[PDB]
Write a protein that binds this ligand. Structure first.
Ligand SMILES: Oc1ccc2c3c1O[C@H]1c4[nH]c5ccccc5c4C[C@@]4(O)[C@@H](C2)N(CC2CC2)CC[C@]314
Length: 442
């Protein structure tokens, strides 16, 4: 019995001792840092303070739990039992709560930048931390009193005593803890980060396409034709008198412009522009059936053309259109490539035409990638998910799948996973040391 169990028990005592050392001292150091210095007092970092407190509390109880696997009993007492269990559950909850609040906050920062400035204060983060701990206490305060010491045959056991029927409330608890400590929060993170990950890459819609084409300038400028244009391709007038252009600008905005407008106003014009482009596509009988017979992408390209030169001029290329609605792509590209349009603005027309030919935004794709902090938070979350996915899924499988406790193969698997889940709490401080400038310069 002992040639098997003892080696593993001692090895686990060692591992647990290491995770305890590094984990506790690291997280305490981080807490200390976020408190003392002012160059660290942001929202995200306060969240990291919460994560640190939780994980340090988790790593403090690690000796007592290695004593469990060595001595095969609980010698210390019942208050200590209550404490270790309570803390274990607390860590399990506050960790994931804090992580999803970080992901939401990061998402707010990056994806909603204009409005971020107004409610991303550190006091907000502090408030949120306190709320996290209370919602945790929702589950933690009962666990603290339902933890009790009862002698199983041959040993003294520190365990949870669900009021009879025990097994019922047991499975209920394993379920609720599977949902609200795993499935739900991970889904929230997946929505947030999914959004701020899908937004970064290339271009994928008409608006961003035209933003690449007509570009953006705040003050009045003379376009490729020599006319007075402002913002994103918005034509003001034909009159070479600049005063006329400004009068039209004040006419189309509603204040005294002074020749320069704000980006919000440029876009507020842009919308009505693409509007009229579309309404024009529908009003024109020569466009609508060629428009309705297309997929969203090539539709967007057609709208690019109409935005550039109007339904008047787009209607002219009848043969090209007939090639388009015939779905003979490369032929339509052939006819379009040789015209006045390609001659005038060659590059843009080349891109739009390629778009027409392939049915993708491939001709427009330029790839940026993440951010400093955002990528950091991503990594931290991925780490937590990797450490806690086994043990969370396992505990559910274990209570719902037969063959449990059959052999050391499985028992070793399970214990390895409990371990990994714990080791996360020591992995956190290592990560901050590589991923944040505010931590590494110190
Ligand atoms: O409902 C839980 C979900 C996930 C985890 C457990 C939960 O009840 C504890 C629990 N009961 C079990 C019964 C059979 C096999 C494993 C467990 C564990 C695992 C663990 O002891 C560990 C995993 N700690 C967390 C810590 C290792 C990360 C939290 C409390 C507990």
């Amino acid at each position: 019995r002992s040639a098997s169990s003892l080696a593993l028990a001692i090895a686990i005592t060692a591992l647990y001792s290491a995770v305890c050392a590094v984990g506790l001292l690291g997280n305490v150091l981080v807490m200390f840092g976020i408190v003392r210095y002012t160059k660290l007092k942001t929202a995200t970092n306060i969240y990291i303070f919460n994560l640190a407190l939780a994980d340090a509390l988790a790593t403090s109880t690690l000796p007592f739990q290695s004593a469990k696997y060595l001595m095969e009993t609980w010698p210390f007492g019942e208050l200590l039992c209550k404490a270790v269990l309570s803390i274990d559950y607390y860590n399990m909850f506050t960790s994931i709560f804090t992580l999803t609040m970080m992901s939401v906050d990061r998402y707010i920062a990056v994806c909603h930048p204009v409005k971020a400035l107004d409610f991303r204060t550190p006091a907000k983060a502090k408030l949120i931390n306190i709320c996290i701990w209370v919602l945790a206490s929702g589950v933690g305060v009962p666990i603290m009193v339902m933890a009790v010491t009862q002698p199983r045959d041959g040993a003294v056991v520190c365990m949870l005593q669900f009021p009879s029927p025990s097994w019922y409330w047991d499975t209920v608890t394993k379920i609720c803890v599977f949902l609200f400590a795993f499935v739900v929060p991970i889904l929230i993170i997946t929505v947030c980060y999914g959004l701020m990950l899908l937004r970064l890459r290339s271009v994928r819609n008409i608006f961003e396409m035209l933003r690449i084409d007509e570009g953006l300038r705040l003050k009045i400028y003379k376009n490729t034709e020599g006319y007075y244009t402002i913002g994103i391709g918005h034509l003001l007038t034909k009159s070479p008198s600049l005063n006329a252009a400004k009068s039209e600008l004040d006419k189309a905005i509603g204040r005294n412009t002074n020749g320069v407008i704000t980006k919000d106003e440029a876009e507020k014009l842009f919308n009505q522009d693409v509007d009229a482009a579309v309404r024009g596509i529908l009003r024109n009988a020569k466009l609508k059936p060629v428009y309705d017979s297309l997929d969203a992408v090539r539709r967007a390209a057609l709208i690019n053309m109409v935005f550039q030169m109007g339904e008047t001029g787009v209607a002219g290329f009848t043969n090209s259109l007939r090639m388009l609605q015939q779905k003979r792509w490369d032929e339509a590209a052939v006819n379009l490539a040789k015209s006045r349009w390609y001659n005038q603005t060659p590059n843009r027309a080349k891109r739009v035409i390629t778009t027409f030919r392939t049915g993708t935004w491939d001709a427009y794709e330029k790839d940026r990638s993440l951010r400093r902090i955002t990528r950091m938070v991503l990594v931290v979350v991925g780490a937590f998910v990797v450490c806690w996915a086994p043990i969370h899924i396992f505990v559910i499988v274990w209570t719902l799948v037969d063959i449990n406790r059959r052999d050391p193969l499985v028992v070793a698997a399970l214990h390895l996973c409990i371990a990994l889940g714990y080791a996360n709490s020591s992995l956190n401080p290592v990560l901050y040391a590589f991923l944040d400038e505010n931590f590494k310069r110190c």
